[PDB]
Design an enzyme around this catalytic site. Structure first.
Site, PDB file in Angstrom:
ATOM      1  N   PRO A  19       3.979  -2.414   1.114  1.00  0.00           N
ATOM      2  CA  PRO A  19       3.699  -2.743   2.515  1.00  0.00           C
ATOM      3  C   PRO A  19       2.215  -2.753   2.837  1.00  0.00           C
ATOM      4  CG  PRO A  19       4.339  -0.463   2.355  1.00  0.00           C
ATOM      5  CD  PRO A  19       4.440  -1.022   0.959  1.00  0.00           C
ATOM      6  N   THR A  50       0.825  -1.202   0.000  1.00  0.00           N
ATOM      7  CA  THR A  50       0.000   0.000   0.000  1.00  0.00           C
ATOM      8  C   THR A  50       0.863   1.256   0.000  1.00  0.00           C
ATOM      9  N   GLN A  51       0.867   1.968  -1.129  1.00  0.00           N
ATOM     10  CA  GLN A  51       1.649   3.196  -1.222  1.00  0.00           C
ATOM     11  C   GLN A  51       1.095   4.283  -0.311  1.00  0.00           C
TER      12      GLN A  51
END
Lengths: 247, 229, 233, 233, 232, 212, 239, 239
Positions: free
Chosen positions: F105, F1-2
């Protein structure tokens, strides 16, 4: 599955390759084709297989398949198996000209295909090509050249050679009437017609059963020209009349 | 995973038997007779259903490739279709590159290249289908025949299917290079009449023509008009 | 008629069962594990007098502290001794320590029995190895002598003979061997049994011998050093 | 006749010969015995003599701290399957930070051993294993065969002439759970002794004994450490 | 990809595809060579000249590098693959090592290549045997022989191809320190051995000599006739 | 997950004698907005383990189906071996570390409570894979606004009771309601004991007193 | 030589490698199941070869998901693979569609995995027949059975093992449609003992399990208290 | 007939080029021992097949040869039941990719051609055998109206005015071919009776209401509907 595999790439108990030796007999029944190395040029005399009257003319030739601007070939064998080889030879010759910006030497192009024809006689389990085909051309180094490539993947240089039907009797005739270095172009056209007679079961040559293509140098440019029907008929009439004066 | 070893191998006397046996499946097929006239080419085949329940308007034995090219077959039904759907793809891949309608002699070389790939690459049998390909390009008619081996031959007139040897000798007598498209349709119908064994009608055959206006197959109404003579 | 992976009615796995029979066509190699070191002796089997004996290596260097004797087809063992040299360097590179003789023979024998004609890898082995390797050298546990069969079964041996004459040569090793014998007596005990199993005459040319001492490294006796041991036999 | 050459070919009796020939190789191997009490699980194995001068084998391998195995079959195929067991046990402690249950490790072997049996061109694993381990549920004797199926045993013996040991184990199988650590090993010794010819006896050199327990990890005992256990036999 | 085992073991520990590959070597043209002092000489026996041949491309004596050359016996096609792939290794060796190849190096590369296709899936062994001569950096002459099985050995004199069993017995008796002394006497030893395996007579052969001071130059058909006359 | 989208807020926890209790309020947050207030951020893994998480709620549902389904897979064969609360804490730490190595992540931050073998386990797992076990845990702004209150009581009295730890959680959750903007009134309280995980319904912080 | 591959039909249009595969099921001990109004009850005759084997070894009853049970008859090796495949089929469904897999869909996904190996020579058909059963509020009880050929039919009761026909005659007269689960448990144990042969196979252990409404759609092995009551009731009727 | 080499196993050319192996896939269709009858009228198309329950323990709703490929297209299968379900899943997946790629519902014209092209790949490749079943698809085309097609293991999808399959295919085709004489064979909603009497004549069964399963497509109702045994009894009592 091992039960269905024919084991094409294996060795015979005597040290032979079956599919290579059996592909040689397919050529013995194939169309008769020969070539003659002369001083000013080289020719290809190929006996046309299908003479059927309802056949038309498509493009420029039958068994010729000109490979490049400076050289051409002739094929004797499985008709389809020759088409894949000619497309590969036109790719190899152009990948050379693309890479080196020079015309392909005839000795280099023959070696390139004989590596492809061999790759199927060793690994892959496929069948080898049943086509043995000649080569004619001109390069900057050794000049006019003539080659022969067997399905085994081996080639060799030849001054005079013949492939296809009655090739054994044709080579024996070329071992005599041919003279190294003394043969001109017009003398080779007469020798090509002389061999195509005894090596063909037909009573004579009607000019529709043979196709001749010559390769010569004109003004520093290699020209590949297939002799037309009127030009071939003049050669047949010349040999037919000269044979009467010799007896 | 598939077999990587070739099923077609050279026989002891130098021949490819799977291709030679593939010609036997063609010889037992339905008769198909193409004829190349001066202004056009006609393809006439015998479309015969085993019963009256079969729908004749369902499948077409004469199918076009592009607007100017169509082809007919003598042999197995299914092996023709996977072959003709690829011929339609090869013709359009040419049109994407060159933005030009594909020449007939160029399409036959690419189709004959595919029919060979299955006589060599392992795990696959040859086709049991032979083709009669017609087309109009550069103001000239074209008629070609693709064998299961992958070898193509340019023909003025020829025939295949059942009794092709007796049919081929029938064309050589009545064929003329000065014939037009209209006169060539009748000669193609008379050849299908040579070996028939029945009463032929508009739904008992399938005919199509290729001229300067493009390739099209004759409707069942137009076929009946040519059967009166 | 059948594949390379098959089990016999007795479960012998024919391809390895036949690969062992190929060893009985090879030259004889003998080795002895003493407390002062190990010795490796092998017959060269000179085919013709024009053959240069210096080009025949049946004993090669694995590491500085390890050496190996070969038998059977000389070619098939070339790929194993090459993987052994890479395995010993990969251990010294990562762990900064001399690789024990136990882990060397275990890593090489893992290549045995690994073969197949179906989806093995892009490259693959069509047949097992027809070779029998005697590994030897000095490790942290002392001098060790190992054997490797085509079946991948490695066994620790005090004295073992391999090759065509392996039968009847092993019977001579078990009679003359005892745990207290030295390396000098091991070099002499090897040639006496070779003299029995070698067809041609035994001289410095047709025999190849090398030893591994704990203090020294692997070294092969030259032509002048072999002439001294032969005179004692 | 033609049904035995491939593992994917069923016989007219609904039987696979190629898998049964693989189970013949584990009976042509060396006799190994194992059994469990309510506390400890013990593996006892004959180390087989290929010759008189050869240190026999090592037939008991370490898998994890709580798990150990015994080998009857092709040895190189055993450690090929054992390297998978070692990697599978390190996978759990890496990810889950817990010892992998012995019952779940054997389920991973049956899934891996089957794949070669059903696919063409591949052969079944020709090694049987006696897996001794201590999980939260107690000792585990789980057996593996060339056929991918596994069995949970109270006591089991495999290898050559193991039927004579299974006769001994089946008689005393009721009192195994009440045995102490020292007395439990002596039952496996007598069971493994019945697997020997009348001219052979159990010694310190040919016997290796694995032991796993609650407060005791899995440890192999060499020729020197098996003397206290052979004192009562 | 085609994956199958062509070369497998047989009862009594034999490899049929490898043994039959050596039978194809004995069916090829005879190639003989010796190792002298400062000189190494290779020679071959052409089966039929026929005087239609172009003698340049049919030569069985190739050049792997400036200091290394080889002559084979066997299937002609199987050789050209080995020579072409060995020349790539000779150039790849000058790239990394920055030194010319030793004669034993290129022999091990060819021997390891002939081995790899014996144990590989779906690949037949080569049907050729090679005789490699050359000079190391120190100037010592070398003669090696490779087999389809992948085994290589150094030789003082060797013979490959048909009739090599009789020529090898001929070289074994006649090779001494006297015949290997003179550079011309070394050339005459090969010709005397070739004339034993040539049934047609005269010189149908092709001979090539590679010295150290200045690289290999193959002898012309007229130059080989001068030595053939002196040995008559 | 940006970048996270719908995020949760601080999740508390404490271990007492006999079990562990955690609490998390029910609210979704997108860009300083209360959007989904009915979401339950406390998960029941299996009988002996209980879990709750702050951060992106979408990544938390992914860890509900991946971790929850792994519990079924362990219960299908039924050999008597179940995942301990620290074995799930070890698996979940490894999953969080393998995501940042690929630079993908999981934005969440997790607190794994549990009671097994008569021992209470409480553990912390962050976005970057930093993991440990402490007697009291608070995520997000709970580390600032709450953990000082948790450590103050647990320093004087290392072992609590079930009722005393419950008043400790409710008093720390009330402080999060005053000074944390992302917080919310209603909150879940789940407790694991020898009888298993019991997730109570919504409770109110409405007993807070505002003197202005 | 038509029977040496699964990719070859016989002259009469039969595939023997598929037909020889189901003959291995006829050499395996009998396992039955019964679909009643309140759920599905399974039972297995489990033959223990040597007394050394621990009770529970070679478990014939697998749980592919929490609401679905499985019972196998055939080669035990191929049975454990299809159990893992059926677990993956039910695993991938709950991940994608978020709810428990219907046993109508689960039996079809597994039947197409079994059939996929009957069309090629590179693989062999499975040698194990097996049955599936479950319970749901909306879908109710369902029992399907998959043959080695890959075919799946619906069944009220089924028998797979050494004696296929002998147990079908016992299940047909049972009248299971009006009977609850606890009444079937006593009937399954009666059918297992009557089809057993005291001559050839001696030692055996009865393995029983059900799934239904009383477990709230959860498949589990029968508790020892209920299993002991059913084994005693079955031996009393055996006489 | 002459057979040489491996004609008898892999699919390749017989000396007469008959595909000696492919002809056995048609004989494998008769292994099911069933007969399907399909006939189309002017406003409707009807498919009727035999429903045989070999055991009383079978579940009637689960055993069916009529499958729904899409909303407007029905199916009936004759052949190996194991090979049947595999070909139906391909037809459903092939008809779904059509709607996803090409935007509109797939015609019955080109749903059979793509399945016929797949069944050919089995005939040309030697690594796989043809399917032992034949598919019969029906539906309502926009321009052409009702359509009845059948593809075989050889890949021959050619159309039909009415279709027969199974063991009685030869007998039921010649009998119904005499009904190619009456105009449209009395084509309207009662063509159900046309298919029933054809199947009842060759089998001489005189089927009951539950002995056969029927399904229809119509112009007013383009959706495929499987008729209930109560609705089948209405047409069975009228003949």
């Amino acid at each position: 599955s091992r039960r269905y595999d024919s084991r094409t790439t294996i060795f015979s108990p005597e040290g032979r390759l079956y599919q290579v030796e059996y592909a040689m007999e397919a050529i013995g029944h194939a169309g008769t084709c020969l070539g003659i190395l002369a001083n000013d040029g080289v020719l290809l005399a190929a006996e046309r297989r299908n003479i059927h009257k309802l056949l038309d003319e498509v493009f420029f030739s039958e068994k010729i398949y000109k490979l490049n601007e400076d050289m051409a070939c002739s094929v004797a064998g499985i008709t389809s198996d020759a088409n894949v080889l000619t497309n590969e030879l036109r790719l190899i010759a152009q990948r050379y000209l693309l890479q080196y910006q020079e015309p392909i030497p005839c000795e280099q192009l023959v070696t390139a295909l004989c590596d492809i024809k061999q790759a199927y006689t060793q690994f892959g389990g496929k069948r080898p090509f049943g086509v043995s085909l000649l080569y004619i051309g001109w390069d900057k180094h050794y000049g006019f050249q003539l080659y022969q490539s067997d399905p085994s993947g081996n080639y060799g240089g030849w001054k005079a050679t013949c492939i296809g039907n009655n090739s054994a009797a044709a080579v024996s005739m070329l071992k005599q009437d041919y003279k190294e270095g003394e043969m001109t172009l017009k003398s080779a056209l007469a020798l090509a017609i002389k061999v195509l007679n005894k090596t063909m079961d037909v009573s004579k040559l009607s000019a529709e059963k043979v196709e001749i293509a010559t390769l010569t140098r004109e003004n520093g440019k290699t020209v590949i020209r297939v002799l037309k029907q009127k030009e071939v008929e003049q050669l047949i009439k010349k040999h037919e009349e000269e044979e009467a004066k010799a007896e | 995973r598939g077999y990587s070893f070739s099923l077609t191998t050279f026989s002891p006397s130098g021949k490819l038997v799977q291709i030679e046996y593939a010609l036997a499946a063609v010889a037992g097929g339905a008769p198909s007779v193409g004829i190349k006239a001066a202004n056009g080419v006609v393809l006439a085949t015998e479309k015969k259903q085993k019963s009256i329940l079969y729908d004749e308007r369902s499948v077409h034995k004469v199918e076009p490739i592009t607007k100017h090219i169509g082809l007919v077959y003598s042999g197995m039904g299914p092996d023709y279709r996977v072959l003709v759907h690829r011929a339609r793809k090869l013709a359009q891949q040419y049109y994407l590159v060159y933005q030009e309608p594909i020449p007939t002699a160029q399409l036959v070389q690419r189709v004959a290249s595919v029919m060979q790939e299955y006589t060599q690459s392992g795990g696959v049998r040859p086709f049991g289908v032979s083709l009669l390909i017609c087309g109009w390009n550069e103001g000239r008619p074209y008629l070609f025949q693709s064998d299961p081996s992958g070898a193509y031959f340019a023909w003025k007139a020829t025939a295949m299917g059942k009794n092709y040897v007796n049919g081929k000798t029938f064309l050589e007598k009545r064929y003329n290079e000065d014939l037009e498209l209209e006169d060539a349709i009748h000669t193609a119908i008379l050849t299908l009449k040579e070996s028939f064994e029945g009463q032929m009608t508009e739904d008992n055959i399938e005919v199509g023509i290729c001229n300067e206006a493009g390739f099209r197959r004759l409707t069942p109404t137009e076929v009946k008009d040519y059967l009166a003579a | 008629d059948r594949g390379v992976n098959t089990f016999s009615p007795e479960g012998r796995l024919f391809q390895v069962e036949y690969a062992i029979e190929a060893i009985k066509l090879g030259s004889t190699a003998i080795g002895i594990q003493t407390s002062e070191g190990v010795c490796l002796a092998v017959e060269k089997r000179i085919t013709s007098p024009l053959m240069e004996p210096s080009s025949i290596e049946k004993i090669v260097e694995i590491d500085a502290h390890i050496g190996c004797a070969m038998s059977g087809l000389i070619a098939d063992a070339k790929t194993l001794i090459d993987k052994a040299r890479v395995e010993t360097q990969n251990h010294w590179f990562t762990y900064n320590e001399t690789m024990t003789v136990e882990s060397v023979t275990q890593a090489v024998s893992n290549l045995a029995l690994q073969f197949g004609e179906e989806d093995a890898d892009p490259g693959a082995m069509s047949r097992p190895f027809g070779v029998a390797l005697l590994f030897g050298g000095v490790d942290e546990k002392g001098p060790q002598l190992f054997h490797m069969d085509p079946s991948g079964t490695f066994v620790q041996c005090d004295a073992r003979a391999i090759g065509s004459a392996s039968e009847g040569a092993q019977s001579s090793l078990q009679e003359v061997y005892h745990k207290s014998m030295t390396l000098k007596e091991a070099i002499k005990s090897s040639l006496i049994i070779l003299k029995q199993v070698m067809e041609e005459k035994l001289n410095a040319t047709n025999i190849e011998l090398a030893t591994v001492q704990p203090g020294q490294n692997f070294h092969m006796f030259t032509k002048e050093e072999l002439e001294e041991v032969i005179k004692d036999i | 006749n033609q049904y035995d050459n491939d593992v994917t070919v069923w016989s007219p009796q609904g039987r696979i010969h190629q898998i049964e020939y693989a189970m013949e190789a584990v009976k042509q191997g060396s006799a190994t015995v194992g059994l469990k009490s309510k506390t400890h699980a013990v593996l006892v194995a004959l180390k087989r003599a290929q010759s008189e001068l050869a240190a026999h084998q090592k037939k008991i391998l370490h898998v994890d701290n709580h798990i150990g195995i015994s080998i009857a079959g092709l040895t190189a195929d055993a450690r090929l399957l054992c390297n998978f067991m070692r990697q599978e046990c390190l996978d759990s402690r890496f990810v889950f930070d817990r010892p992998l249950p012995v019952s779940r490790l054997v389920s991973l072997i049956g899934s891996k051993t089957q794949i070669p049996t059903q696919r063409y061109g591949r052969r079944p694993y020709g090694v049987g294993l006696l897996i001794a381990g201590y999980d939260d549920m107690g000792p585990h004797i789980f057996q593996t065969c060339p056929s991918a199926n596994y069995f949970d045993c109270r006591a089991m013996s495999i290898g050559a002439r193991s039927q004579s040991a299974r006769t001994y184990l089946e008689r005393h199988m009721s009192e195994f759970m009440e045995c102490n650590l020292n007395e439990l090993v002596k039952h496996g010794l007598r069971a493994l002794r019945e697997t020997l010819p009348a001219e052979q006896d159990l010694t310190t050199k040919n016997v290796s004994i694995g032991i796993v327990g609650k407060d005791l990890e899995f440890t192999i005992y060499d020729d020197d450490d098996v003397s206290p256990f052979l004192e009562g036999l | 990809s085609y994956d199958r085992a062509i070369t497998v073991f047989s009862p009594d520990g034999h490899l049929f595809q490898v043994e039959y590959a050596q039978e194809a070597v004995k069916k090829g043209s005879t190639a003989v060579g010796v190792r002298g002092r400062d000189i190494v000489v290779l020679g071959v026996e052409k089966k039929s000249v026929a005087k239609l041949q172009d003698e340049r491309t049919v030569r069985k004596i190739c050049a792997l590098d400036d200091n290394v050359c080889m002559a084979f016996a066997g299937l002609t096609a199987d050789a050209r693959i080995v020579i072409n792939r060995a020349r790539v290794e000779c150039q790849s060796h000058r790239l990394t090592v920055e030194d010319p190849v030793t004669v034993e190096y290129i022999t091990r590369y060819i021997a390891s290549l002939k081995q790899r296709y014996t144990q590989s899936n779906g690949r037949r062994p080569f049907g050729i045997s090679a005789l490699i001569v050359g000079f190391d950096f120190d100037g010592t002459p070398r003669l090696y022989q490779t087999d389809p099985s992948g085994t290589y050995h150094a030789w003082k004199a060797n013979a490959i191809g048909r009739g090599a069993k009789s020529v090898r017995e001929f070289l074994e008796k006649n090779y001494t320190d006297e015949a290997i002394e003179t550079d011309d006497l070394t050339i005459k030893l090969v010709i005397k051995a070739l004339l034993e395996v040539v049934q047609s007579g005269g010189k149908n052969i092709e001979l090539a000599v590679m010295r150290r001071d200045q690289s290999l130059k193959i002898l012309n058909p007229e130059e080989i006739e001068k030595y053939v006359a002196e040995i008559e | 997950t940006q970048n996270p989208m719908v995020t949760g807020t601080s999740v508390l926890g404490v271990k007492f004698e006999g079990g562990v209790v955690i609490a998390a309020d029910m609210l979704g947050s997108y860009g300083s907005l209360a959007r989904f207030r009915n979401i339950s951020r406390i998960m029941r893994v299996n009988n002996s383990t209980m879990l709750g998480a702050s951060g992106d709620y979408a990544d938390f549902q992914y860890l509900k189906q991946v971790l929850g389904q792994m519990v079924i897979d362990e219960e299908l064969l039924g050999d008597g071996h179940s995942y301990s609360p620290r074995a799930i804490h070890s698996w979940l730490t490894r999953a969080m570390y393998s995501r940042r190595s690929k630079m993908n992540p999981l934005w969440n931050t997790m607190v794994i409570g549990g009671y097994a073998d008569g021992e209470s386990f409480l553990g912390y797992v962050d976005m970057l894979g930093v993991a440990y076990e402490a007697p009291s845990l608070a995520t997000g702004y709970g580390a600032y606004l709450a953990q000082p209150l948790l450590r103050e009581v647990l320093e004087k009295q290392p072992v609590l009771s079930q009722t005393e730890a419950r008043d400790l959680v409710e008093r720390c959750m009330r402080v999060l309601y005053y000074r944390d903007a992302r917080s919310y009134n209603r909150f879940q309280i789940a407790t694991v004991t020898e009888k298993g995980v019991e997730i109570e319904g919504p409770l109110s912080t409405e007993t807070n007193w505002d003197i202005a | 030589g038509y029977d040496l591959s699964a990719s070859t039909f016989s002259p009469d249009g039969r595939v023997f490698q598929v037909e020889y595969a189901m003959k291995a099921v006829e050499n395996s001990s009998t396992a039955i199941g019964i679909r009643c109004k309140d759920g599905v009850v399974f039972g297995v005759e489990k033959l223990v070869l040597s007394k050394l084997y621990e009770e529970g070894s070679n478990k014939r009853l697998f749980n592919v998901d929490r609401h679905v049970g499985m019972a196998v008859a055939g080669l035990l090796a191929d049975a454990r693979s299809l159990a893992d495949i059926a677990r993956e089929e039910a695993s991938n469904f709950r991940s994608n569609f978020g709810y428990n897999i219907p046993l109508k869909h689960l039996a079809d996904r597994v039947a197409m995995y079994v059939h996929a190996y009957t069309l090629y020579s590179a693989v062999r058909p499975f040698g194990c027949s097996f049955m599936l059963g479950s319970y749901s509020v909306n879908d109710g009880a369902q029992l399907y059975m998959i043959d080695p050929s890959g075919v799946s039919y619906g069944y009220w009761g089924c028998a797979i093992g050494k004696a296929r026909q002998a147990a079908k005659t016992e299940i047909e007269k049972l009248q299971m449609k009006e009977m609850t689960c606890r009444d079937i448990v006593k009937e399954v144990a009666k059918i297992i003992y009557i089809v057993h042969d005291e001559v050839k196979d001696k030692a055996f252990e009865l393995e029983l399990s059900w799934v239904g409404e009383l477990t709230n759609g959860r498949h589990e092995i029968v508790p020892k208290d209920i299993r002991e009551e059913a084994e005693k009731y079955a031996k009393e009727s055996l006489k | 007939g002459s057979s040489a080499g491996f004609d008898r196993h892999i699919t390749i050319f017989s000396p007469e080029g008959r595909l000696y192996q492919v002809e056995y896939a048609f004989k494998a269709i008769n292994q099911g021992g069933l007969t399907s009858v399909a006939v189309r009228g002017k406003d409707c198309a009807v498919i009727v097949t035999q429903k045989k329950v070999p055991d009383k323990l079978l579940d009637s709703s689960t055993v069916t040869h009529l499958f729904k490929i899409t909303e407007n297209i029905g199916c009936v299968m004759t052949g190996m039941t194991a090979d049947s379900r595999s070909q139906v899943q391909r037809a459903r997946y092939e008809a779904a990719n059509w709607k996803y790629k090409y935007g509109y519902e797939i015609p019955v014209d080109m749903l059979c051609k793509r399945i016929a092209d797949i069944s050919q790949v089995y005939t040309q490749n030697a690594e796989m055998r043809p399917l032992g079943c034949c598919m019969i698809l029906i539906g309502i085309d926009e321009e052409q109206g009702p359509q009845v097609y059948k593809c075989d293991p050889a890949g021959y999808y050619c159309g039909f005015k009415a279709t027969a399959a199974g063991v009685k295919q030869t007998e039921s085709t010649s009998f119904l071919e005499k009904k190619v004489k009456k105009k449209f064979d009395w084509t309207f909603e009662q063509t159900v009776e046309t298919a029933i009497t054809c199947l009842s004549t060759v089998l001489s069964i005189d089927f009951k209401p539950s002995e056969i399963e029927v399904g229809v497509v119509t112009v007013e109702n383009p959706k495929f509907r499987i008729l209930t045994e109560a609705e089948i009894d209405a047409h069975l009592v009228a003949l």
